[PDB]
Ligand binder design. Structure first.
Ligand code: CHL
Ligand code: CHL
Ligand code: CHL
Ligand code: CHL
Ligand code: CHL
Ligand code: CHL
Ligand code: CHL
Ligand code: CHL
Ligand code: CHL
Ligand SMILES: CC1=C[C@H](O)CC(C)(C)[C@H]1/C=C/C(C)=C/C=C/C(C)=C/C=C/C=C(C)/C=C/C=C(C)/C=C/C1=C(C)C[C@H](O)CC1(C)C
Lengths: 163, 207, 222, 192
């Protein structure tokens, strides 16, 4: 996209220099070893480490000197940008399927009790913890339920409004 | 009943049926009867090859020490592969592998089905006697009349000498690895000063 | 059942009669019977692949440590083989894709319909090679040329294959992680651990315990 | 006979010509497959007679079998025995196709089963055949003599793949050096 790597971008280096300069300008009003001086020094160290880490990660910077993420799985894989969107996509989808499968399993387990509505606002905490730990293996069980036809309710068993 | 540890319990599957049955199975390795049969055959095979190996290692060792042999007996048994023969090392292994393949396939065919390999393949009149054990053949393997006169006793002597030979061959292998000496040298060093030249002290000096 | 992975726990009932079963399924992945059959086949295939791979890594490495042969180490063996390979990289990949497509489709079709690859017309006259044993993951035929599946110790060999398979899978993942963390070979890692087991382990390779996640590593040190 | 004494032979291999019960992988279990494989074995064996008799007979007449088609690619002319021989390599494959594919197309057109394996009639000069007592005896002789012939021809190819030389002279090296010259000594058949 016409971008340049942040490790060689002049705007990136200028932004790091300006942020460090502003923090150092704030730093000179306090005595050495005081709590504000230590806090500002820790902020300066974090700023330097962050700019170094963003430069070392292969991030691409625009004309504004700011990192730009690449989200097409093709351009990310062939140019080393998969850690920006693609691997976070896989991680989020795994965790989201975990949460959804744990909720579905808890709802289905509570459906079989004598008071199904009771477990929805007074949580069965041991059962919820057991079901929550079992959500790690959600893709296998979910894909099997999809192949078996047990994941979906039949259309004849679901209420609809008159058309 | 004789046993390896008098006054101790004997496993229920060892009732003296096997030759050399002293009830020694602390790990309960042979529990199913088929595994026990395979282990009996393996004990016989390993013991007989260990008896041959012990004889072949002891014969060279005194020949090299006394000089009654040649330059071949002067080399140690673990350095006998560096000696030059008429054939290279690659071909001798192949011909012995082929001969062993024939012999051991015949033996294994007897092991799977007893009495299956009892006839000469090229001479229909030369056949081994019937009632042959899988580990105890007959006929040309016993050219002398030795299987009358307490067959049960001679099996016990065979398995005893086999176990002693297996221990002796393992001692050869281990003493060559640690000390790096021929068996007679180790025996002479033990007979030199046994209270300092044994497994203790030497291995403490090795460290 | 071979035993219990957690003594005192309630083992699942669907893992009672499987070979190599210790009742280990805390995630309940094999609760569905079709899933259990598919995962039995998958564990066997993974086990045999790891078995052969760990053999082809460890036996050359042990022979090199004893000084018998001088072969390239496993993480670089692809480089030295490809330079002396008459067949270049792309056609090797294409040939592997074709051959594995064929053989894995045959294995998959036998999994879906047992014994179907041994019927008349399944192959071009050679379907007797793959008649099947009627068991999931145990094909036989050419794959058992010595015919020791008909022997009495068939059930013990199934248990031996599965346990050695799990050991081999853990061993290969150990090889990969040990290279990625230490940068050396597996026998080198073993000898470093045997020389000083307190100081040479995963806690000192600088990778397995990250410094940011474990600030006490840099504090509680001499 | 038996290929492995004491082993249980398959029941479907009993009564066949040249039968030793050798089918550990069950390739001839289906009778339709078994019938085709006998014709495949006999044709493979009969072609192995021609290959060996040729390779060996030509070099017993001073004519290697590997060096025989070495006048077309490098350059030269075909030669049979000592007579200067006409035709070219491009023309040779034309007569190769019409003669063999014309003959082989008649090999399988018949609806009989024994005639695909054992033709008889116009294909048996010098009498022979007769009723049963010697026909089955040379039926056993044909498969067994054919079996070494295809083993030898594969051995001819594999030896030249490992040594690069002829089989007759490599036989002479096996009598000159029986223990220092075999398939184990060269670094091709068994590496390391
Ligand atoms: C098990 C597969 C496998 C693994 C773990 C490795 C691992 C390695 N190879 Mg290697 N290779 C593998 C298979 C093959 N390689 C090669 C050819 C080479 C060469 C020429 C070189 C390496 C090198 C390397 C090392 C460098 C790191 C790397 O390239 O990561 C690769 C990591 C992977 C996981 C590769 C992907 C393998 C894939 C998962 C196999 C299965 C794919 C199928 C399509 C399956 C798909 C699903 C099915 C169900 C449809 C590393 C140790 C080199 C190195 O030493 O230099 C730095 C080196 O020069 N390999 C071929 C030839 C076709 C293989 C065949 O499968
Ligand atoms: C919203 C869907 C979507 C869109 C609009 C694009 C768009 C693009 N992709 Mg991407 N991708 C998309 C989803 C996905 N892609 C990929 C995997 C790839 C690869 C492997 C490649 C692309 C490439 C490309 C480019 C050229 C594609 C083409 O047709 O060339 C005609 C173009 C920028 C190519 C490239 O990276 O840039 C040129 C390329 O090599 N995509 C996957 C994984 C299956 C996706 C899901
Ligand atoms: C069991 C939890 C649970 C599952 C599996 C689903 C599943 C779904 N929701 Mg429903 N929802 C769930 C809880 C709740 N939802 C909603 C309100 C909605 C709306 C308004 C919509 C959906 C839609 C959808 C569908 C598309 C995914 C999505 O849009 O996520 C979005 C989910 C949310 C915005 C709420 C999620 C809250 C929380 C993360 C989930 C609840 C967690 C449980 C408390 C966990 C308890 C488990 C313990 C006890 C073991 C999908 C069928 C959309 C649709 O119908 O697609 C076709 C749609 O428009 N959900 C509320 C009230 C806020 C919930 C509580
Ligand atoms: C059957 C056991 C046996 C074996 C395998 C060998 C092995 C060998 N020896 Mg004896 N020897 C054996 C029994 C005996 N050798 C000898 C006395 C000798 C001598 C004096 C010599 C051999 C030599 C040889 C080699 C002759 C070729 C050959 C490697 C010769 C040699 O070592 O290499 C040429 C040699 O000079 N052997 C005696 C004493 C009577 C034996 C009993
Ligand atoms: C991919 C390899 C693999 C597969 C498909 C299986 C599958 C199976 N296991 Mg085996 N296992 C596998 C590897 C290993 N297992 C074991 C140890 C056992 C025991 C002790 C038992 C089983 C049993 C079973 C069966 C029923 C449980 C199930 O549904 O699992 C389905 C599994 C999957 C669908 C794969 C899920 C993999 C997941 C993504 C892993 C991700 C997290 C891992 C912890 C990461 C690994 C890091 C490690 C290497 C340090 C089924 C045949 C039980 C059975 O009854 O015997 C047959 C049983 O008792 N496994 C070890 C040693 C640690 C392995 C290595
Ligand atoms: C998972 C199995 C496996 C894989 C992927 C490799 C991979 C490799 N090996 Mg290794 N090996 C493997 C198992 C084993 N190997 C070895 C012993 C060796 C040696 C001694 C050497 C290698 C070498 C190599 C490299 C050169 C490729 C090659 O061997 O030429 C390709 C060879 C062929 C195409 C001919 C062999 C065909 C083979 C007999 C077919 C067998 C098919 C069977 C049905 C088995 C199928 C296996 C199962 C698991 C699918 C390559 C990186 C070389 C090296 O390390 O680097 C240069 C080398 O010198 N391997 C043993 C014995 C302990 C194994 C078990
Ligand atoms: C097959 C199992 C296995 C064996 C025998 C070894 C052996 C060894 N590893 Mg390796 N590993 C093994 C699997 C795995 N390892 C690793 C990751 C690593 C790393 C990163 C390192 C080692 C290192 C070591 C050394 C021990 C010190 C250590 O840090 O422990 C490893 C600690 C662990 C928590 C992994 C243990 C996994 C194992 C499956 C646990 C179960 C063991 C069984 C209960 C008993 C096994 C008995 C043996 C005889 C089979 C030693 C040479 C170190 C080395 O390279 O230099 C000294 C080192 O830095 N391992 C993973 C990925 C999680 C494995 C799976
Ligand atoms: C361009 C070379 C080309 C040759 C013969 C081909 C073809 C063949 N020759 Mg002829 N040859 C060739 C040159 C030469 N050949 C021969 C001398 C013979 C003899 C004596 C024999 C053949 C045989 C054979 C055939 C064995 C299989 C067969 O069809 O039998 C059908 C094989 C097709 C054999 C044969 O034809 O079987 C009867 C056979 O006996 N070759 C000499 C030396 C005069 C050659 C130069
Ligand atoms: C060792 C050599 C050898 C033996 C013992 C036989 C044996 C037999 N063949 Mg085969 N053949 C042999 C070499 C060859 N045959 C053939 C191709 C044929 C045909 C085409 C036929 C035979 C027939 C016969 C039978 C009677 C004719 C005969 O040759 O008797 C010795 C007899 C069963 C005939 C038949 O099967 O029964 C009458 C018949 O038609 N053979 C070729 C290709 C040229 C050979 C080289
Ligand atoms: C039975 C079965 C059973 C089970 O089940 C399984 C198994 C085991 C697999 C199986 C067995 C087997 C066998 C081994 C196979 C192999 C074979 C043979 C070798 C073929 C051939 C094949 C061979 C034959 C055809 C032949 C060919 C021959 C030819 C003519 C040649 C020719 C030559 C000569 C003349 C010389 C010139 O100058 C040149 C030439 C021209 C070059």
């Amino acid at each position: 996209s016409g971008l340049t790597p942040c490790s060689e971008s002049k705007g990136f280096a200028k932004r790091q220099k300006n942020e460090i300069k502003a923090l150092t300008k704030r730093l000179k009003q306090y005595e050495e070893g005081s709590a504000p001086s230590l806090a500002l020094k820790a902020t300066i160290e974090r700023t330097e480490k962050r700019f170094a880490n963003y430069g070392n990660a292969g991030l691409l910077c625009g004309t504004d000197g700011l990192p730009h993420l690449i989200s097409d799985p093709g351009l990310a894989l062939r140019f080393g940008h998969a850690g920006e969107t693609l691997i976070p996509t896989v991680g989020f989808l795994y965790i989201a399927g975990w949460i959804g499968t744990a909720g579905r399993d808890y709802l289905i387990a509570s459906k079989g009790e004598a008071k199904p509505r009771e477990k929805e606002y007074i949580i069965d905490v041991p059962l919820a913890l057991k079901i929550s730990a079992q959500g790690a293996g959600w893709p296998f069980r979910v894909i099997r339920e999809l192949q078996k036809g047990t994941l979906l309710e039949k259309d004849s068993n679901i209420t609809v409004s008159p058309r | 009943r004789a046993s390896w540890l008098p006054g101790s319990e004997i496993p229920s599957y060892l009732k003296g049926e096997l030759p050399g049955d002293f009830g020694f199975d602390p790990l309960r390795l042979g529990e199913d009867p088929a595994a026990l049969k395979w282990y009996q055959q393996a004990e016989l095979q390993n013991g007989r090859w260990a008896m041959l190996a012990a004889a072949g290692i002891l014969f060279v060792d005194l020949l090299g020490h006394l000089g009654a042999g040649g330059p071949a007996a002067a080399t140690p048994w673990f350095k006998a592969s560096d000696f030059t023969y008429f054939a290279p090392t690659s071909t001798l292994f192949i011909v012995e592998l082929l001969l062993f393949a024939w012999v051991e396939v015949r033996r294994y065919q007897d092991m799977v089905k007893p009495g299956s390999t009892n006839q000469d393949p090229i001479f229909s009149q030369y056949s081994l006697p019937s009632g042959n054990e899988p580990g105890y053949p007959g006929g040309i393997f016993d050219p002398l009349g030795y299987s009358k006169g307490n067959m049960a006793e001679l099996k016990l002597k065979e398995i005893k000498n086999a176990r002693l030979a297996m221990l002796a061959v393992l001692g050869f292998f281990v003493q060559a690895k640690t000390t790096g000496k021929t068996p007679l040298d180790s025996l002479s060093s033990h007979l030199a000063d046994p209270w300092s030249n044994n497994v203790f002290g030497i291995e403490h000096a090795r460290l | 059942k071979a035993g219990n992975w957690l003594p005192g726990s309630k083992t699942p009932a669907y893992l009672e009669d499987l070979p190599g079963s210790y009742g280990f399924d805390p995630l309940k992945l094999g609760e569905d019977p079709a899933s259990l059959k598919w995962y039995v086949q998958s564990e066997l295939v993974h086990s045999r692949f790891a078995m052969a791979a760990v053999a082809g890594i460890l036996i050359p490495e042990v022979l090199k440590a004893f000084g018998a042969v001088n072969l390239p180490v496993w993480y670089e063996a692809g480089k030295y083989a490809q330079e002396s390979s008459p067949i270049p990289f792309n056609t090797l990949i294409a040939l592997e894709i074709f051959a594995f497509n064929f053989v894995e489709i045959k294995r998959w079709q036998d999994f879906k319909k047992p014994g179907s690859q041994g019927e008349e017309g399944s192959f071009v006259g050679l379907e007797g090679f793959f008649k099947g044993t009627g068991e999931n993951g145990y094909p036989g035929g050419v794959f058992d040329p010595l015919g020791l599946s008909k022997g009495p110790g068939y059930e013990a060999m199934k248990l031996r294959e599965i346990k050695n398979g799990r050991l081999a899978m853990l061993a290969f993942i150990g090889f990969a992680s040990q290279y990625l963390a230490t940068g050396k070979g597996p026998i080198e890692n073993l000898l470093d651990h045997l020389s000083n087991p307190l100081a040479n382990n995963f806690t000192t390779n600088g990778t397995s315990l990250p410094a940011q996640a474990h600030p006490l590593l840099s504090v509680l040190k001499p | 006979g038996n290929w492995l004494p004491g082993s249980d032979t398959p029941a479907y291999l009993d009564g066949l010509p040249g039968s030793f019960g050798f089918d550990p992988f069950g390739l001839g279990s289906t009778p339709a497959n078994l019938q085709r494989f006998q014709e495949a074995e006999l044709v493979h064996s009969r072609w192995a007679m021609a290959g060996v008799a040729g390779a060996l007979g030509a070099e017993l007449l001073g004519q290697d079998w590997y060096q025989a088609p070495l006048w077309a690619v490098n350059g030269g002319a075909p030669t049979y025995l000592g007579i200067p021989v006409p035709f070219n390599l491009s023309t040779l494959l034309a007569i190769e196709f019409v003669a063999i594919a014309g003959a082989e197309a008649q090999r399988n057109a018949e609806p009989d089963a024994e005639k695909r394996k054992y033709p008889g009639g116009a294909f048996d000069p010098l009498g022979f055949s007769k009723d049963s007592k010697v026909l089955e005896e040379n039926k056993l002789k044909e498969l067994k003599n054919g079996r070494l012939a295809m083993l030898a021809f594969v051995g001819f190819i594999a030896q030249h793949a490992a040594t690069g030389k002829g089989p007759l002279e490599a036989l002479k090296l096996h009598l000159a050096d029986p223990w220092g010259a075999n398939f184990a000594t060269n670094g091709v058949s068994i590496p390391y």
